[PDB]
Amino acid sequence: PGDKICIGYHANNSTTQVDTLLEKNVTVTHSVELLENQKEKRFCKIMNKAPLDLKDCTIEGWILGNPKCDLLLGDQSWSYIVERPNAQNGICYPGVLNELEELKAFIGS
Amino acid sequence: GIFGAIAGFIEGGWTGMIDGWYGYHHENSQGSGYAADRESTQKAIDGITNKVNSIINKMNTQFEAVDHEFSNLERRIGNLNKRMEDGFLDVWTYNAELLVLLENERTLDLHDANVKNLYEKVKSQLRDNANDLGNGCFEFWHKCDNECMESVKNGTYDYPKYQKESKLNRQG
Amino acid sequence: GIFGAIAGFIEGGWTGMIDGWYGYHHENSQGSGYAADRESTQKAIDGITNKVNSIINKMNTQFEAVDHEFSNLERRIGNLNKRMEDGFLDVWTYNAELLVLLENERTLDLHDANVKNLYEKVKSQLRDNANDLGNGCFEFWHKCDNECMESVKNGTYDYPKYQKESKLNRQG
Amino acid sequence: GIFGAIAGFIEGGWTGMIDGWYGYHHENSQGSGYAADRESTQKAIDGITNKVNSIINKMNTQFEAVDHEFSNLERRIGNLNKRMEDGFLDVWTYNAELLVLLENERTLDLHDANVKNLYEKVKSQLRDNANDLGNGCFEFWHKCDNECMESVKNGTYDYPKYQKESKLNRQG
Amino acid sequence: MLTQPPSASGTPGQRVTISCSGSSSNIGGNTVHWFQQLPGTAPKLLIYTNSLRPSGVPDRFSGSKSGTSASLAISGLQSEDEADYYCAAWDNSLNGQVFGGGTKLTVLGQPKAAPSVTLFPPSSEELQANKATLVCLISDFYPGAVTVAWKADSSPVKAGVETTTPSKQSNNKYAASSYLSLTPEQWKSHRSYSCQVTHEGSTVEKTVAPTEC
Amino acid sequence: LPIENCDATCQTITGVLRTNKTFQNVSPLWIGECPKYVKSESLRLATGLRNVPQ
Amino acid sequence: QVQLLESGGGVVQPGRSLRLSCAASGFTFSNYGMHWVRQAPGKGLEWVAIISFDGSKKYYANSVKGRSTISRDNSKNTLSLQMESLGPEDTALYYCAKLPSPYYFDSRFVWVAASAFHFWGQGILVTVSSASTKGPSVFPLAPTAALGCLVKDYFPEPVTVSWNSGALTSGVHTFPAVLQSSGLYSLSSVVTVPSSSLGTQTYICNVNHKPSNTKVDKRVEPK
Amino acid sequence: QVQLLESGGGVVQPGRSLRLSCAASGFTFSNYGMHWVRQAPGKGLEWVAIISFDGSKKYYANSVKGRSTISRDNSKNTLSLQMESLGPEDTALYYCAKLPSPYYFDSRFVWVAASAFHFWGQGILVTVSSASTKGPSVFPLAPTAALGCLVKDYFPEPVTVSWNSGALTSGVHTFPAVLQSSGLYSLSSVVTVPSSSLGTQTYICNVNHKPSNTKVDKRVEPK
Ligand SMILES: *[C@@H]1O[C@H](CO)[C@@H](O)[C@H](O)[C@H]1NC(C)=O
């Protein structure tokens, strides 16, 4: 019988919910997540430069030259160094490497 | 809600309108359908885009922190490092989370405010040429053509063209 | 104010109404008194409760810090510890204080917005069956029964039941 | 905008009015000109002044930090100092910048809200004694004297004094 | 009253979900709330105002309310969630609270261990207590199904049997006990009491036969 | 963790974050331009409005 | 948790009238609306009664609408209830407990609170049938092994069967009450044990038939 | 940047019909509205064509309103274009590129994005006149000094004149194409050099007349 017009807003099948000081777990139309928790559980390059690994030794036996860590040798370059926790080839002849923590810090750079 | 538009006197949204955020829906013997509002939706999208862009820009400053090796006699420096890094983590986490909450709040408020503003614009353009309902819908007293429909959509509705017409058709 | 409801066109609050935050007051020969609005007051209380709960939740992260003993030759580490702890204290204090201020601001704004929304709902339900004053009070043109009073409180007021009645009683 | 007053249904501002922030402009054969609103402008200025004062007060807490000399064997303590100072700088910069953005947002919103509140006050005082346009301007049905103009400026406009006069003059 | 699903299931770290439906009188009008009843314990408040966690600060629990429906969700769902769950609303049409009565759940418990059976007849105090009662017990097994058979001298009784505890909140250890009460005029005159427990996890029958010695 | 032939721009202690997001919850220790580490689980920003379909 | 205690629990006879109560403490109580809820033994709950901070709104249940009558003394900080017309259809546990209710049941000053009293006080069992209070009989069972105690001939299930008066729970199991043909319920409780602590540490199961206030214990020893 | 590639470029004859296309990759493409823009050789741009994520809105230009026809395959992730009535007035480069457009051209799900696809894919040159594909001729010039190579008799300017196949750019200069009276354009490219690497490191200029797919190179050596 009569003419009509309405003023509405967009709705869809969106089920992604957001939170708010007043109401929480409220379904919104478009939500953008800012946090990233999914990762590739491996070690990649940085600036296309190959990292360094020991896999049986420590940094101590590496720069001291333990005969069982001679795979790392000569002129080398890297971006970051990986040290395995259960390594067994470290300081062979017992002693104390002075300022070892500062040495590791200076080697990391 | 706060402005009463979203989930208020306009209870449900329109699952059909996929041409924009805020828009109208008209149904007469000449035709039926939804039609979004270009300017209001584009302005809201621009505001939201600038908000998100600024939020990500001001947060790009990375706090670098690595755990150096600490000796047996460096318990104090280790505890200092731990406390500093944990405090920075707590500060950043709190800031980000509460910013997210407050921004979602004021964003939804801005959305329903835009809806109410569009409704009140349509109201002010149809002072007495149309009756109002409790669902954000207007019932023209004189039947409008689709050209009048667009003239209301664009906001160029002409009042003296239909003043006497609606004044005559309104009583019967 | 911002919405003009609290301390605006409704100057004073009602010391008598203790049944809720926002409510009505009606006085006719059938009866007199205040009566709160259940839904709006409960929604405002829910919003405030969630706000306070989230504020306390996101702030529960404690920054642990103890002052270890520093020697005569540890002036630098002591100054570093002092600067770190003082900076964290300043950051937390500033954040908490400014959050408190802004939250009180927007909370009072939300309260007066709820008041104005209730008033505008009552206005939209009584388009021409009642006159409006400058104090948020409505004067029914036709006298309403207490059942009509509740039908306005719940929002189920029927317009065509009193249209002609108010149209006749409005001129005299 | 959000409230539609500034850059909305009132498109342009008045370069002439330099007596206040929000005000009226009236032009009849008796006289013409702009005139600011004392109470609303003073209230907005008070709010802005308190906002700025609190912002500067809660930010006066200075984070002191100097770079002590670190030896060849103090690379770790130097890196810790650098990371702590850089993190504090990032936190303070982010906080200040985002506070500035949000505060400018809500301040402009408060300004246009004050404009809309003044317009709606003038609307509620002139229920049917004046017609409304789409530019925030009111056209009195009966011609008002300058004394009526002030009575609207101060808000003491008397309705029953001009009710029948406007009711008679409105049709012709 | 209210509606409530029967049960729920999910592996540890699978985000178990539970629903709660009502009407416009209870759920569509007012807020809902949740409750958790640990086995045999006075229960606690789970969630109020449809999303809020109380000062008990349980983080893994999530609440949602959408019109006529409400939803509870648990991420991770460690073994400390083996308990009854309950949903409630206000029923604005009536006045008092309304409850969806009863929903339990179970976690993915890998049943590699068969139940350990123990069969020991009582002592002379039971003989002097005017009635004899022999028991056979099983414990530390995942699924609720377990079959017990009584045999008094290779002959069962016309109907007398077991009971079963809820899920052990530590390591999903269900347990059951079968009771067999007979009179002393029918207890000592038999020469071999036996109970045979059969279960899906067991390959063969678990027979425990105590002799009257 | 092993070393694999992989090209990335952001290397963390417990993996790789090859993303454009601004935050993360993996770890604070990294090399490159990695997102910021936070204790949060999700940082969803509502860009639209309340979804109320019919 | 906060301070709570009950009064009136046990085993009451049918056809008579019941008068139960509960009193809490720890902080202010004269400004909160309290709840009374039911729990059928096994599975099932059903809300029962509400009470305001002052007592204006009564608002009883549907099943007992106008059948009971609750009351509270905010000067004594107690919540009591008197009801007649009792039958076995109400045999169940009942809890006095603060649940999230609409705002008007709580006081004008406590409409907002960080922790809205997640309190839910303990339970009170009532069981009505043609029976009385009897004496419980505990029989232990002797042979890594496992040993247990059975509790027969005690009417309700109010006992938390304890071992050495609350000593061992890492590997214990408490089974529900068992009925067959008698008037009183039987029950079992078990606990594992290695093969090195059979005679050294004496193990005694301690029970309590509270309607009889029993503390009859039993040491478990082999042949 | 993201993955992009073109198809149909080169030198086409006038009066015929053209059919160009471009395909991108790197992430989803079936949900964005793409653009086609023009660039007159030297100075001047002019937008040409739009296309939605689905193809509803066509909305051609003014200069070619209804003259061309664009299309896209979102299952193949490609954007093609077919046009007739070609003349030398359209001799120019053209880019398929995402530019900031109104929201309705983009999908319903991508109305908001942090980085709104600042992509602007590469160019595709089309030159229509009375000519064909010829063979380029490279002449080097020999004498801190400077040496160069001239490329004459090659029709378009598609070559990135390279030295030792992309070796030196710190001090090189690539000059625009030069016409005088012939049908094909001449061009120069220069690079400085110290007085200590004239005969040690051999320097070769490498060009590519792509419409002929030439790789004719030339070593530069003095008398
Ligand atoms: C909110 O509750 C819903 C339950 O439907 C859950 O899926 C979601 O993860 C919760 N959190 C957010 C932020 O939506």
Residue numbers in the entry:
A (entry chain E): 9 to 55, 55A, 56 to 80, 80A, 81 to 96, 96A, 97 to 114
B (entry chain F), C (entry chain F), D (entry chain F): 1 to 172
E (entry chain L): 3 to 9, 11 to 27, 27A, 27B, 28 to 95, 95A, 95B, 96 to 106, ...
F (entry chain E): 272 to 325
G (entry chain H), H (entry chain H): 1 to 52, 52A, 53 to 82, 82A, 82B, 82C, 83 to 100, 100A, ...
Anything the authors wrote about it?
Stem-directed bnAbs prevent the release of viral contents into the host cell by locking HA in a prefusion state, thus inhibiting the structural rearrangement necessary to fuse to the host endosomal membrane. We recently reported on the discovery and in vivo efficacy of the VH3-30-derived bnAb 3I1427.
A point mutation in the light variable domain, termed 3I14D93N (3I14D94N with prior numbering), was found to increase binding affinity and viral neutralization potential by approximately tenfold against H5, with no negative effect on binding or neutralization to H3. The 3I14D93N mutant shows increased binding affinity towards recombinant H6, while retaining similar binding affinity towards H3 and H10, which was anticipated based on our previous studies. An engineered LCDR3 point mutant, 3I14D93N, shows a sevenfold increase in binding affinity towards H6, while retaining binding to H10 and H3. In the H6-bound structure, the electron density around Asn93LCDR3 is well resolved and shows a hydrogen bond being formed with Arg38HA2. The paratope–epitope surface potentials are each relatively neutral, with the local environment of 3I14D93N being slightly negative despite the positively charged Asn93 substitution. In addition, Ser63LFR3 hydrogen bonds with the side chain of Gln33HA1 (group 2) or Asn33HA1 (group 1) on protomer 2 and Ser67LFR3 hydrogen bonds with the side chain of Glu35HA1 (group 2), whereas Ser65LFR3 can hydrogen bond with Gln25HA1 (group 1).
